[PDB]
């Protein structure tokens, strides 16, 4: 499998500081079940979104269901089954920072995973239970798909 | 107070030791009195170096020029050896202290065993040794790096 | 999503909702209500203590609208089964919540052989009439 | 160790033994002595069963209560030495001293007597004379009591001073006859202040 | 960095190949607000400032003369200190 | 019996063994063993101490010297409490109570005090399994001290008693007015909101009573106080309140408001949704969005300095606020009849102008005064005036504002006077802001500017008194004078101006609150001056 995290998000806000870049838009989203905050940079030119939209976000370690753990090089001539066939927006990046409310005595209840998709940043802030597949300096796929419900 | 809380590495609290060190090491650093004495001597030498620094550097200018960028080397080691700074590590603090002490022997500017030569060598690398001991502390190697 | 048996379901409910100090139903109840547990409550509701019933009924409202939409019939069943408990608290709460899955609102009926409600409503209404 | 208790009415071990010697049933008399004559508080009587239950006898907390009341008395009188009207409170301390001069002979309450004597600026002369008669009472007395004692005791004052004079002579003759034959260190070398 | 609906790379992704070896460097852009480091979004810059390079990969930030120029601690300086001089020469040529 | 006699003799050798609690048992065992008691007597001769009698003797010594006997008894009892906690064992207590089988009178003495009852409560909590603790609890309940037993959580678990307590508390609240509601609110709210079930039932009955349009405002205020208290405790039930109302016909609005109140922030998406639906031909119930928490968050967003809001949705925000505040609806039997939207264009323009003035912190106060005509024109609406006072509240809440404030009698206080004049309901908020300013003791400015600011605040609160808001202002002055946190010159000038502006006759409450004000020597020895018009002498003579 390799599904590090899966949930349903709705776009609660678009970039509040203004459009710093024309093609890239900042999104502040909330969860539905686990109630965790999300900040994401998206290529708004090719995948336009607006306020009030909902989408399924499935962070996955690999696109292959059998979990063969590909190296991470571009090989378009690959006929193996992939998760991207059932998702509209796919990004590939690496997680570079993990925060938390860690104390010197007891553990952390909230975590914050920072991932960079080659420049486009995403921060997933939530309770520590739902964020366990995130280990710093590891590759991650985004795999979000809009919902019509 | 901040200096003491950042460079003491107290061996009294057990929960913090479990959080930062493996179980095979926390019992060793909790039961052995020799290790605690070594740690206290290390902190005292750090305090003496702090006094020396405050004497040499008035106006509180903490920017200095030194040969080796210790923080960048620590970062490089962290990225090379895949530290994962979230789980307790396997590094006895006495290993850090002994390593720093033996490293200070090798970095020589004045070569010789004469007391005059010894004093000159100690003076030549004084600032770098102070910086190295303030960077490779027992607590920092277990709580920050 | 395993089928948790009646004694096992009661043990699970009295362990997760057994915090008497937590008279407030924790937000975790939103994730503590699934299809299997609600389905299996049909037999373990007899052995639940009154505090457990009150906590579960108060947490039943802290659910997503889509979850309520997809889990209607089981929740109607649990409401009708809660309407047959010794504590009138559960009876009244289930009676009002029977309309929650249908329209999203809470029913409003009082003074129906409820002496404390009768006294409270009468005295507060007459006092408000005195100090209108 | 328990002399002088009989004067104030608090029976000591001597009379306790003399009574239990010719009593067939010590239990009832002991109970009435510890309850009526002792702490006449229903709270302590209700506490007694619990302290029996723990296995720690009534001995330990009775001793702790006695010691803490002794400490509270001494600390309270220490505060008293600097609060209230000076003359009236001094006379009250004198009254406490004349009451406790019967119990001065029992060491478990002797520190109370010595503390009161220390606090009082001028101890009555008869009490000072009786204290001077015993060595332990004299040594236990503070510097104020010693000052009050020495003002009228010529021979005692001279005898107390004499060992210090002998020590001064010994150290002077050790300095005059010292092997350090150096110019910088002689008999008169230290400054007068030193 | 993007696979669907069309495979598109990013300038930072391509520049990560130019950076030699495994170089770790942190700089700040010329137009970096000072108050940004105070509140939230410290590690996720809205203005794409705070250049960060880990393992010789440009994670985030916009490069200017503050990080590629003739200043102490610049990217070329870290390249010369960590790698040799031949590697730095290749770095210059590849960038150009 | 050699071992028994030897162990008994060794026990007797311990310092003061005679007052053992088993000395009866030990001596009975010794007598059974055949040991003659003369050795015991001889050993206890030197082995006795009056650790029970001379304690009392020192007690009367302290009493004679001047110490209170009550304090001595309290110290003795506290030491007994501590030594009993550190020397308690329950199981053997159960054994001895099974041996006895009767109700102990010494246990009655044990319970007779409050501290020892608290010790019993602690023991019962620590050792629930033990029998004597439950027996003591039931004895306490039978003796009439069941109230001292833990009842904060017991009240929640009881239906009818809690219902009667709620009924009596609310009846007393409505009897004594807001002054008594402020007193009865803490305990009643804590009892209701400590248990979630109690909170739900209480909110249900308050909502049911508030259904009546006649006098339901008080019931709705009670429900709002209860829900605010519940939210302040970390328990969120706003979605429950929305489900209580008529939000079924508008699920979108209910979901939006629930999310907004749950996360406690202002998001453009839900506000856009609400603007779209409310501006449409079928607006939802306006009363649903009239929750004080939402409006407080909205004022935090658009008035507090440092808060940034979307400029592209600012018009939608203003329209939502105007509809929630100024647009009126008629309801008969909970049925929507007509909608008055007159206060929608001018009101929204005023809101926009006031928000632009307040959130433009770079502009100086002089520029704001330069538009005083428009400021006064817009400040005449209740929501806008309250928002202005809130903006001033955060703006002056910064301690450095007084350093940047270069007027003895600034314009902010004039706006406060305008707020007090404009609306009567805003008087408590003006009073709270003035109390916050006056209680703010400054250690970073000269005392002279503090004195000027306090004199100006006294003028403002005199104005508050003049407009009918007398009782709280007079009570606050009385409290300040009896607390010595105000300069005597300030009090003298305040009272002089009060008696200068006001004229007889005076109500019973006013004279009852003001006679002790003159009773203080700090006013009698200062304001009383030789003149034809002496306010203190006049007020004394007229009463």
Numbering used by the authors:
A (entry chain H): 2 to 150
B (entry chain A): 914 to 1058
C (entry chain U): 1 to 132
D (entry chain V): 1 to 194
E (entry chain A): 578 to 673
F (entry chain W): 40 to 582
Give the authors' words.
To gain structural insights into RNAPII stalling, we performed cryo-EM analyses of the EC species stalled during transcription on the nucleosomal DNA template in the presence of NELF and DSIF, but without TFIIS. The major classes contained RNAPII with its catalytic site translocated either 1 or 3 bp downstream from the initial position, and we built models for the 3-bp translocated complexes (AEC1-nuc and AEC2-nuc). In contrast, AEC2-nuc revealed a different NELF binding mode (mode 2). In mode 2, the NELF-AC lobe is farther away from the secondary channel, exposing the TFIIS-binding site. Furthermore, the NELF-BE lobe in mode 2 is reoriented toward the downstream DNA, forming extensive contacts with the RNAPII RPB5 subunit. This change causes a ~35-Å shift of the N-terminal α helix of NELF-E (α1), the only resolved part of the NELF-E subunit, which forms direct contacts between the α1 helix and the downstream DNA backbone. The AEC2-nuc structure revealed the direct contact of the N-terminal α1 helix of NELF-E with the downstream DNA. In AEC2-nuc, RNAPII does not reach the downstream nucleosome, but the NELF-BE lobe is close to the nucleosome. In AEC1-nuc and AEC2-nuc (left and middle), RNAPII is backtracked with the RNA 3′ end extruding into the RNAPII secondary channel. Thus, the NELF-binding mode 2 is involved in RNAPII pausing/stalling, where the downstream DNA contacts by the NELF-E basic helix play a critical role.
The metazoan transcription elongation complex (EC) of RNA polymerase II (RNAPII) generally stalls between the transcription start site and the first (+1) nucleosome. NELF is a large, metazoan-specific protein complex consisting of four subunits, NELF-A, NELF-B, NELF-C/D, and NELF-E. It binds both RNAPII and the nascent RNA transcript emerging from RNAPII and inhibits transcription. DSIF, a conserved heterodimer complex of Suppressor of Ty 4 (SPT4) and SPT5, is required for NELF recruitment and RNAPII pausing and also serves as a processivity factor upon the pause release by NELF dissociation. In the present study, we determined the cryo-EM structures of mammalian ECs containing RNAPII, NELF, DSIF, and/or TFIIS stalled on a nucleosomal DNA.
